[PDB]
From a paper:
In particular, approximately 80% of the HIST1H3BK27M tumors contain mutations in ACVR1 (Buczkowicz et al., 2014, Fontebasso et al., 2014, Taylor et al., 2014a, Wu et al., 2014), which encodes a bone morphogenetic protein (BMP) type I receptor. DIPG-associated ACVR1 mutations are known or predicted to confer gain of function (Buczkowicz et al., 2014, Fontebasso et al., 2014, Taylor et al., 2014a, Wu et al., 2014) by mechanisms that may include neomorphic ligand responsiveness (Hatsell et al., 2015, Hino et al., 2015) or ligand-independent activation (Mucha et al., 2018). Furthermore, we characterize E6201 as a dual inhibitor of ACVR1 and MEK1/2, and demonstrate its efficacy toward tumor cells in vivo.
E6201 is a covalent inhibitor of MEK1/2, which are effectors of PDGFRA signaling (Goto et al., 2009). In ACVR1, this cysteine residue is replaced by Ala353, preventing a comparable covalent interaction. Therefore, to obtain mechanistic insights into the inhibitory effect of E6201 on ACVR1, we solved the 1.5-Å structure of ACVR1 in complex with its interacting partner FKBP12 and E6201 by X-ray crystallography. E6201 occupies the ATP-binding pocket of ACVR1 with a binding position similar to that in the equivalent MEK1 complex. Both MEK1 and ACVR1 form common hydrogen bonds to E6201 through the kinase hinge (for ACVR1, at His286) and catalytic loop regions (for ACVR1, at Lys340). The missing covalent linkage in ACVR1 is compensated for by a van der Waals interaction involving Ala353 as well as two additional hydrogen bonds: one involving the threonine gatekeeper residue (Thr283) and the other involving the catalytic lysine (Lys235), which is displaced in MEK1 by its distinct αC-out, DFG-out conformation. Further structures of BMPR1B suggest that this kinase favors a more collapsed conformation of the ATP-binding pocket that would disfavor the binding of E6201, potentially explaining the observed selectivity of E6201 for ACVR1 over other BMP receptors. E6201 dose-dependently inhibited BMP pathway activation induced by ca-ACVR1, whereas its effects on ca-BMPR1A and ca-BMPR1B were more modest. Taken together, these data suggest that E6201 can inhibit hyperactive BMP signaling downstream of mutant ACVR1.
Residue numbers in the entry:
A (entry chain B): 0 to 108
B (entry chain A): 170 to 186, 192 to 272, 276 to 499
Write the structure that this text describes.
């Protein structure tokens, strides 16, 4: 979809999709377009939580997870204006970076 | 709390083992969960606010539009270098929102800046030595390159002053504000001076900065600029140590010869043309601790930067004083 491509790695339940105000519990690995990993909740074995609609994560990560059902694992390819844009994140994400996230939607709270 | 869930982490847990602060993606989420509470600093750089996150205090620097390149530089440094030390301000997170707001989030030190602290209390030999030794320890840690995978480039601060030093609850200090820092690695001899048009605080500028003789492509030169400024901080602190029932009022360096917000020319005339240095109060020479600190100050203030001692030598000298 706009700003984020979702490639399914393994299906969710096909029925339970995140709604505004629910907390998404996920595992993720974030990479630059050249495969360089910059962050992974899997490496610290600690799921990551964010509330849908609170703008707590970049727009592409949120709108990608919104298209997933519980249990789904997917590769999200996020365009820069749906990520960290022209500034990037100094020392981590270069300017105008397309990001690749491997995300698993573990549960909703 | 009523909002606590199994699995919740404190900031200490999130900081527990790339970069100095929280995991990158956690930085935005924590930043956008902070409640701002009280303004604890304001200057040309912007503002600093005490905030709270899940019941924990944090400090939030919100940068002015004029100082966006300091936010960029400081964020870049803390994210690319593992900079964790008892006497260097602990970085937590950086975040931006689209005008734009730029935030840098750090540990909160309720005792405040050293500049303010010296105006609220006097010191004794224990508290004075603890303060100045901790600053020397932090500065030596910045200046020294550590090799290997758990290492760090050498770092020069370039804006050391009592307002950029915070007091911890245990009475040691930590050095803050790396927005002007420059980095160097011996492995490549690469000097990374960055892109920031900001200059150091004029009152604390070394002679070679004020007369523009500093060799701008030489990392060593930036370390010696820090040493000059450290000597001025040592003078500010020592004045507030009581000896024989006597103490000086808090004053900033060169309080008697330049106005508030001094110009480049004000400072160049005092420091370069007239070769003035802060005066040593006579009562210091009746106290062995202040006598030792006066000798140390003088060794930071040589007009020839090569004559100045290293941060490590300062640290070793202060470790030997009682
Ligand atoms: C009562 C607690 N007062 C407090 C407690 C604190 O934790 C801080 C500050 C104040 C910041 C004061 C402004 C300071 O003089 C200088 O301008 C500066 O910017 C230094 C450090 C910045 C980077 C960080 C964010 O500031 C603090 O952490």
């Amino acid at each position: 979809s706009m700003g984020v491509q979702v490639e399914t790695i393994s299906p969710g339940d096909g029925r339970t999709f995140p709604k505004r105000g629910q907390t998404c519990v996920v595992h993720y690995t974030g990479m630059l377009e050249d495969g360089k990993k910059f962050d992974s909740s899997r490496d610290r074995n600690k799921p990551f939580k964010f509330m849908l609609g609170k703008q707590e994560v970049i727009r592409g990560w949120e709108e990608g997870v919104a298209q997933m059902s519980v249990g789904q694992r997917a590769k999200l390819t996020i365009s820069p204006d749906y990520a960290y844009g022209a500034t990037g994140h100094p020392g981590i994400i270069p300017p105008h970076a397309t990001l690749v996230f491997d995300v698993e939607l573990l549960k909703l709270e | 709390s009523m909002t606590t869930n199994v699995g919740d982490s404190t900031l200490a847990d999130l900081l527990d083992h790339s970069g100095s602060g929280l995991p990158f993606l956690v930085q935005r989420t924590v930043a956008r969960q902070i409640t701002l509470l009280e303004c604890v600093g304001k200057g040309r750089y912007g503002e600093v606010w005490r905030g709270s996150w899940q019941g924990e205090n944090v400090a939030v620097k919100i940068f002015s539009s004029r100082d966006e390149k300091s936010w960029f530089r400081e964020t870049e440094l803390y994210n690319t270098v593992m900079l964790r030390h008892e006497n260097i301000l602990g970085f937590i997170a950086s975040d931006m929102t689209s005008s734009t707001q730029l935030w840098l989030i750090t540990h909160y030190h309720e005792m405040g800046s050293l500049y303010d602290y010296l105006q609220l209390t006097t010191l004794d030999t224990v508290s004075c030595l603890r303060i100045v030794l901790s600053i020397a320890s932090g500065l030596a840690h910045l200046h020294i390159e550590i090799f290997g995978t758990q290492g760090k480039p050498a770092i020069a601060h370039r804006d050391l002053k009592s307002k950029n030093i915070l007091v911890k609850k245990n009475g040691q200090c930590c050095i803050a504000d790396l927005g002007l820092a420059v980095m160097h690695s011996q492995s490549t001899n690469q000097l990374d001076v960055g892109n920031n048009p900001r200059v150091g605080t004029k009152r604390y500028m070394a002679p070679e900065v004020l007369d523009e003789t500093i060799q701008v492509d030489c990392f060593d030169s930036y370390k010696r600029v820090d040493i000059w400024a450290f000597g001025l901080v040592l003078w500010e602190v020592a004045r507030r140590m009581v000896s024989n029932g006597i103490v000086e009022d808090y004053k900033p360096p060169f309080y008697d010869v330049v106005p508030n917000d001094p110009s480049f020319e004000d400072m160049r005339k005092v420091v370069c043309v007239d070769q003035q240095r802060p005066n040593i109060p006579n009562r210091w020479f009746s106290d062995p601790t202040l006598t030792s600190l006066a000798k140390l100050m003088k060794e930071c203030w040589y007009q020839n930067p090569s004559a100045r001692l290293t941060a490590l030598r300062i640290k070793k000298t202060l470790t030997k004083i009682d």
